[model samples]
Target chain A: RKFFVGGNWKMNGDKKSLGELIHTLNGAKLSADTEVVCGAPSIYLDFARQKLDAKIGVAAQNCYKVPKGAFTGEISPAMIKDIGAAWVILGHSERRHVFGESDELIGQKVAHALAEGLGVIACIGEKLDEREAGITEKVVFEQTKAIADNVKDWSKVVLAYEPVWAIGTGKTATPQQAQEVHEKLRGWLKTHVSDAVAQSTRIIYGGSVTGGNCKELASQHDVDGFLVGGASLKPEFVDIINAKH
Target chain B: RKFFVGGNWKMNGDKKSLGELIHTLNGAKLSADTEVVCGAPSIYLDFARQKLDAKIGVAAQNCYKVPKGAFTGEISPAMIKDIGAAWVILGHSERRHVFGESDELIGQKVAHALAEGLGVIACIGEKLDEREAGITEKVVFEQTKAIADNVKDWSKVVLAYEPVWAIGTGKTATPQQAQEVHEKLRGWLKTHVSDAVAQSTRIIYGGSVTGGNCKELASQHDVDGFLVGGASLKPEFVDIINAKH
Candidate 1:
């Protein structure tokens, strides 16, 4: 599988910081095997688009299900692409745990965004309580099931598994623990979804990704790449991009 | 009272339409008696700030309750002000009815945006059901009371009255109908809030407002101006801006 690394900048960064981040990416020697995409807060989409080199593409942190209307604070997939963005991050743990987003709603948004020709990084993961209760597999299957049924093609879909507890909490799953879930979901995809999809789709890991831990996780067989969080803003992000090296 | 006109482009307008909208405003002979502000979609706030004429200013259609964090689809008030936008339209009927935004939540957003030094075009209104039930004033008063209690400074806040049934439904309130509610709200403010606030604060009306109908609506005693909807996208918005002429 080709390496795919995404930097989820989340709700951080200013224009000055964004400028320096882009400059760092431009100066770095990125691996040819890796495909890099980063999300900027919607307010900075155009700024990043204009300034970033062709090597990096931009993503809207989120988009509404509908293309356009009276949804006051939302950007549609069309708007994201209209400003030269190529992807959107939907159903992040931040949105689910903090903002009350539901599985059904994120599935609908995934379908809507795809129909508008935008790629989707549909996020799915278990909370600490769910993980502790031993329902982690069940929760992961439930989230992927919605997208699998609602969307036909997995070419534009990347499943990101983010543990709610690990996210921004400085806690990360040991590579073995992450590999267990990734392997389970990969098998789940082959059974519930098609074999072609399971083989071709990229299942990435998110939550507490940093330069120090990336190489060990990158060496895993089932782990395709990463959906980086806090480190996306720092210079060490370049090292994570070259983790396979 | 300084008559105010605010164009809530809402979740509408892309770069092309936004360009033309700014062109229209720049070429027109706007009334000096009015204070003009327009709410562009959040993604375009930066674009509008860079290109819009000096006489015109930008408003973020909405923002989240906090300054910044894990709120995925939201723009922060600090981000809005960082881009040089002066206002944020909170509690619009679109957000209230469509997105299920609560008065309590909008109040929290109002307090946060003000503390961040961004102005608030805080909206309040009733639905057809409440109006038909003869509880229009009751609904509006309850909505205002939430913000009035949460916020101390009324100088930076503009109260916009948008009747849900009339919004984008092409059913406007008659001058008598609009004036009736505005007067009741102003009276409610004087008694429930303070006389200074009732007299000094701008209570603008919204819902199905067009260039043709704005003159009569502008003539009302308590009707300070408009928070235009559908017609804000047309050439006729110029006439609505100059209605006091």
Candidate 2:
């Protein structure tokens, strides 16, 4: 699998600041091999799509499961596709813990988005309490299974392992810790789905990944690339995206 | 107070359909006496604001309480303001029942959206069961109080009453029924808040409203106008907009 880096802006950046970041990215000499995508706030997906370099993809922070209806305040996958954005980030810790999205709901969203012909950054993570209780593997595996159960195509999906305990808490998962989970997830995919999928899917790490530590994390065998957080809004994001160098 | 008609496109409309609707609205002969606003899906709020006539305002179906943050999948009032849109619809029934938004959460969103300099179409209503149980007034009153408590300036607020059972169910409340509730609500405002707010605020009705019934509903002394649902997507929306004629 090729290296992939996603900027999970996660409800941050307005047009002025985001436009500047897009300008910076458009002019930067990013890694030709590293696949890059930016998950934008829903309201600005169209704006980002219009401004960002065509080489770099734009994604919605989240999307609804169905095409369209009376579900007010929600944007559908079709709308995301219509706006020319090709990806959506689902099951982020904030959506799960902060906003109460269930594993089943995320799975449905993954299925619907793929069916609608959009790539999905499917996120799964164990919360702080679960990690402290030594059930990280069990919790993450369960979340992964829920998402995997509804996925019909692995090529259109990127599995993102964002440890809730580390996300936005100024804590970075040690290279060994992130690799351990990524490898186990691959093994789970091999056993449950197919060896081909296990080898082909890109398993990315998220949660406080900065330019300072991205290269070390990217060196891990199973850590294909990084799904960056706060650093993604800065120039260091270019360094993180080119970590493979 | 001017009669206010807001078309809540909800989770529907892609670019082509919405652009055509914008064209239709832009060319139509609308009533100068009534205030018209379109409650567009979040993704289309920018598009609607860009395409629609400036006289016809664009409002977000909903907005987050904060200006900007790490709350993934939510858009802030700051983003709405940044996009040049002027209004936001808060506490719609779908947001309340389908999405599990509590009264406190809606109040916070109402307060924040208003503070960020966006006009708020604050919605309040009761469910069918609540009405069946003879608690319609009680339920709506409680909901209204929650929103009212958070409102500092009533001038920038337009109160929308949308009964859960009636929304998208093709069952609009009769003119007398709507008038009864609107009169009671105005009296409630007069007693709880002030007479000026009770008399000056435009209390709009919403629920399966269409061209056929808009005229009679508009004839009600207390029914200021409407927060249109499914019918708002159709051309008859032009007729509903001119119901005051």
Candidate 3:
């Protein structure tokens, strides 16, 4: 599997700033060995898709579980696809802990997004309290299992391990700590799903990843790539994208 | 306040369909006495704003409380304004009952959106069970109070009354039933907030609002206008927009 770096822009960037980023990205020399995707705010998905180079993919930060309905404020996977975005990031820690999205709800979203032909960046992590209580693996495994149960195809899924403790809090998950979970997750996939899926599916690390530390983190055998947060908005993100170089 | 008709497009319409609706609206003859707003999905807020006539306002279906943050899947009022949309709908029944948004949260969102200079269509409603239990007034007043407490300016606010049981269920509050609630809501405002607010603010009705039933509902003294749902996608929406005429 190739290295994959997805920039989760979160609830930031208006047209002007994003357009500038798109211009910078369009002119940059990026690695052919690494796949790149930007998770833009929903309102800018279409604009990003139109402005960004076709080699770079555009993704919606999140999407609804269904195609369409009376669910106000939600953009469906169908709408994501309609705008020509090829991916969606689901169940990010903010969505899970901050906004009260359950594992069941995230699972349904993953299923619907995949069925609608959008790649799923499925995020799973345990909060600081849960980790401190020594239930990190238990919590992560349960979240992963819920997502896995709903997934009919693993090829379109990129499992992202973004620990809530590290996310946007400026804490970095040690490379060893991230690799440990990725390996455990792959092992679980091998035993529960299939060996092919375990070997082929990409398990990425997220949470305060920066160009300064990305090389070391990228060197981990189990760390396929990164799902960057704040760093994604900076020019250093270009360096992080080429970490494997 | 002029008769205001807002179409909450909800989680429906792709670019193709929405573009057609925009074209129809751009060409249609609308009542100059009415203020028309379209509450488009977050993804299409910019598109709707760009394409639709400036006479017909474009509103985000919802917006987050903050200007920007790590809240994935949420758009903020700052972003909404940056894209030139002028209004946001908050506390719709779907947002409250379906997505579990609290009145406190909606109130904060209203405050932030207003601070960011976007007009707010703040919604308050009771569910079927609550109405059946004869606590309809209790539920709506509490909801309204929560929204009212955070509002520093009432001039940019449009109060929406959309019963949960009626939304998308093809049920509508009869003109008399809707009038009773709107009158009570206005009286509540007069006593709680200010007499000027009660007299000047628009109190709109929503829930299965169609062209067929719009006239009688519009004729009600307190039913200032509508927050239309599904029918907003159709050409018949023009009729609803012109119901006052």
Candidate 4:
């Protein structure tokens, strides 16, 4: 595959603006090699489903592990699948760092989504201090190991390595910095998971990805795609999608 | 003026089942005296809005304080208001207990929701251990006081007191047990807020509320209404709504 680009709207956009966003995306010529998926607010999923072209899939930001019931203020995997959301972004660093969602909890969510035949863009990353302490490899390995524990099948998952420090802070990682981590991650995947899975899986990067920088970042050997953040809200999101073109 | 019964379906219900539940409610004859509002999963809000009767208004299970932002995996109060949902349930015990959402956070949510012109069914409750320790009075008083501190107007707020011990535990508080807490709650309201607010505000009870016990509970002096839990999912939810009749 050439590359896959997913836009995490991340609790942004409204009805009028979302409609316009979808209209712009639908009308734009997204690259054939790139797979474009947008994770909209839960309220706007139906709107995106109704308005966006069939080529562009939708992803839910998060989902509860169980199929359903009594877990108030949560969306279930079944609900996401029912709404035609082909992908779910699980364990985003925001969910981990900001909301205190655990790695085990995310592992459960991954298993549940896969059980329901929904693909997941599983996110794993270390915080700035952890990286500065030279423990990024250990942190990412442990995080990925949690998923490897429950998820026997890797075909349904795309790993998005989003470093906590760089996300939405406007501090983009140099290509070498990203490549070094991506290379280590690929080796870790091969050592832990089957060789087939390591080779086939897409290791995407997410953290303040912008149109101005995505092309060079996407060209990395192990960097399979870009998970555009703030730029996802604008027309430049299309540029990120065609970054590899 | 009679009573207000709000059912927070919370993060429960799937798209198909939610539609069926709303359809059943729409077809039923609801009491004119009881103001019925049901909060659905945000995913199903638009579906509920399009299908639910005008009399039965929709409510968001929870909402973020900010009108809109990059708060991933959070729904905003303004978006809920924009979707034609007239009510938003804030500070439910589950959110407090399970999610680590603080009273101050809920207070900000209330101010934002009210500013958006949406009604709020603010929830307060004492833990079972607290009730056992005879500190129920203090616990509920503090919970309500926190919101009262942030909100100047109580007209748009309905208070639901769901004793944590009794929630989904099949431990219905005797009428006396509920009345004692309710009366103390009203007394606190009168002392802390305006007398008019104390008299005008509807103080409802939750926690193991079902059709079997709703009528008896509804007859209590300070028990103005109910915030049904397990019963809200059943056909008898209508009976609970018609408890006063």
Candidate 5:
């Protein structure tokens, strides 16, 4: 599988900065082997779509589970797709922790986004409490299993493991630590899902991944790519994209 | 004060249909006297902003309370204003009842959006159960006061009275029924807010407000204008836009 790198520009950036960022990205020479996607806030999807390279997918930070209705303040999967965005990120740690989204609700969102023909960057992560409790594996499994039970299609789905403690804390997991979980997750997918699902699926690591640390993490056998947070807003994001170079 | 009409499109429509609607709207001769705004889903705001007639104001169906943050799947008021959308609808019944937004939380969103220089269409309404129990006045007053006390700037704020029962149910409150609440709400403003607020604040009626019934409801002394629902999606929206005609 080609290495995948996504910039999850969570709730930040203005027209000026977004434009300048896209311009720099458009000019940079990224490796053809890496598939890049930019997950933008729903309000900025249209702006990003028009400005970002056609090759790079413009994804919604999230979407509603339903096709369309009285769900005010929500953007539906169809609307996101219709606006030329190709993916929607669900189950991000902030959504789980801050917004109080449950596994069942996130699972429902993944199923609906998949049904609407959009890729799902389904995020799963263990909180500091769960990690401290030594139930990281158990928590990650529940998050992944919740989606697997609800969705049958695995082709367009990419899993992101962003530990709640590391996210925005500048505390990145070591290469070995990230690999330990990724390999274990792969093994579980092989047995629980299909072998094809295991081999084809890209399990990425997130939380405090900077350009300084991306190259080593990118070299890990199980770390397929990254779902970058704060680094994505800076010019160093271009270096993160070229980390594999 | 001039009457105001806002079409809350909710979670509906794709780009093609939105384009068609805007094209139809651009060609129509709307009433010059009415202040018109279209509250589009978040994803379509830029497209709607660019395509809709400059004379017309563009609004977000909703927004987050914070200026910007880790609230994944949420759009901030700063983002809404940056994209040229002049207004945002907060505390709509669907957001309140279905999404579990408390009056306190909705009030926070209103204050934040207003602080960001975005006009607020703050929605307040009674559910069928509350209305049926004869507590409609009590419920509406609480909802209104929560935001009013939190908001110091009334110039950019418009109140929407969208009863939960009438929303998309094809049922509507009679003109007299709508006026009863509007009058009482006005009195509440007169007593609790300033006398200027009672006269100047535009309290618009929402819920199954079709083009057929708009004129009568609009004719009432206190019924400033409309916050339209399903009818807003149809060609008859132009008729509703011209309700006073």
Candidate 6:
């Protein structure tokens, strides 16, 4: 299976900065074995789409459930698709925890995005408290199940495990810790859905991933790929994207 | 002053539809006495800005209060301004009632947009119950007062009066009913803020405003112009613009 590396440029980059970033991404020599996707702020999506190389797909950081309507302050999946976006990152912890988007809503969003024919990078993870309470598996299971219940096919979905404790806090999940969760999630998918899903699904780790640490994390058996965050802002992102190579 | 007609294409249009709409708008012969501004879907702002006639300014339907930052799924006022959008419609009842945006939040948005030197069509309206109970004046006052408290200047703001009872329901407010509210709003501004604000600010009506009724509605004393809805989609939108002439 080809490795998938996604960059979530969450709430970052103005037009000038985004232009510089895209110029750098377009100039870099990326490995052939990896599928690179960069999720940009919605304001910068058009600019990024215009500048980024065709090999690098543009992803919207978030999207609304409906295709269109009077949802005053939202970007619908149809809007994203209309802008030629192929991938969308849904159910990020910021969306789930900070913004109060329930799993059921995320599930609905996934179903809608699929129906609109856009691939989804469905994010799932547990907060520190949930992890400390030894309920990481249960939390992950519930988040995944919410989508699984609505979506019968998981071919276009990429599961990104972004630990809430590590996101933007400068903390990094150790390779073992991330691998354990990834393995457990794979096992759960095999048990609940099917063995084919477990084998085909790309389980990527997020939360404070950087060029310096991504290789160790990438070397693990089940850590199929990564969703780079802060490092994605810098040249190190290219290194992280080529970690498996 | 020239009559101002703004089309609040609220949360509608994709890339293809927006292109066709813009092409039609560009080809249409708009009235010389009217100022035509179309509030487009944010995703299409750049597309509109690049293609639309220089005389016709683009308005973002709504924008975030913050200048920029970590608020996912929101377009900031700074971004709207940067994209060359001179006008933005804020506090539309659809934004306030349907989307749970508070008056205080709308006030902050008004301040933010003005701070960025953008023109604002600040919307205020009373609900059916509020209108029925004879508290329409109080509701409009409260809404205006919130803006006055936060926003020091009224020159860059156009007050759009869209009664909740009439929006999208095809139940047009009688000219008397709309003029009554507009007159009360003007009186409130004169007494509470200043005579200058009362005279200078454009008090426009929205909510099911069509060519069939705009002429009589525009004849009302305090009805300066209109923030059009469905009628804005057709060629008669040009007629609605020429209502006062």
How well does candidate 6 reproduce the true complex, by DockQ? 0.48
**lDDT for position A60 in model 3:** 93
- List where candidate 4 sits over 4 angstroms from the true fold: none
B156-200 in candidate 2: lDDT tens per residue? 999999888889998999999899999999999999999999999
Candidate 6 local lDDT, A134-243, one digit each (tens): 99999999998998887767888999999999987889999999999999999989999999999999999998888889889999999989988778889999999899
Enumerate residue pairs that collide in model 4.
A72-B11, A73-B11
Task: Identify the superior model by DockQ, candidate 4 or candidate 5.
Answer: 5
Highest-DockQ candidate: 2
In model 2, pairs of residues that clash are none
Residue B40, model 3: lDDT of 91
Candidate 1 retains true contacts at a fraction of: 0.60
Assess each prediction's global lDDT (C-alpha) against the native: 0.87, 0.92, 0.92, 0.86, 0.89, 0.85
Report per-candidate DockQ: 0.68, 0.88, 0.87, 0.72, 0.82, 0.48
TM-score of chain A of each: 0.98, 0.99, 0.99, 0.98, 0.98, 0.98
Better of 1 and 3 by DockQ: 3
Off by over 4 Å in 1: none
TM-score of 4: 0.98
- The CAPRI quality class of candidate 4 comes to medium
RMSD of each: 1.4, 0.8, 1.0, 1.3, 1.3, 2.2
lDDT: the better of candidates 1 and 2: 2
What's the CA error at residue A125 for candidate 3, in Å? 1.1
Docking class of 1: medium
Q: Model 3, residue B116: what's the lDDT?
A: 91
Off by over 4 Å in 5: none
Q: What is the lDDT ranking, best to worst?
A: 3, 2, 5, 1, 4, 6
lDDT, candidate 4, residue A101?
90
Instruction: Specify the CAPRI tier of model 2.
Output: high
- Return the candidate ranking by DockQ, descending: 2, 3, 5, 4, 1, 6
Q: Which ten residues in a row have the lowest lDDT in candidate 5 chain B?
A: B63-72
Tens-digit per-residue lDDT, A183-235, candidate 3: 99999999999999999999999999998989999999999999999999999
The model with the greatest TM-score is 2
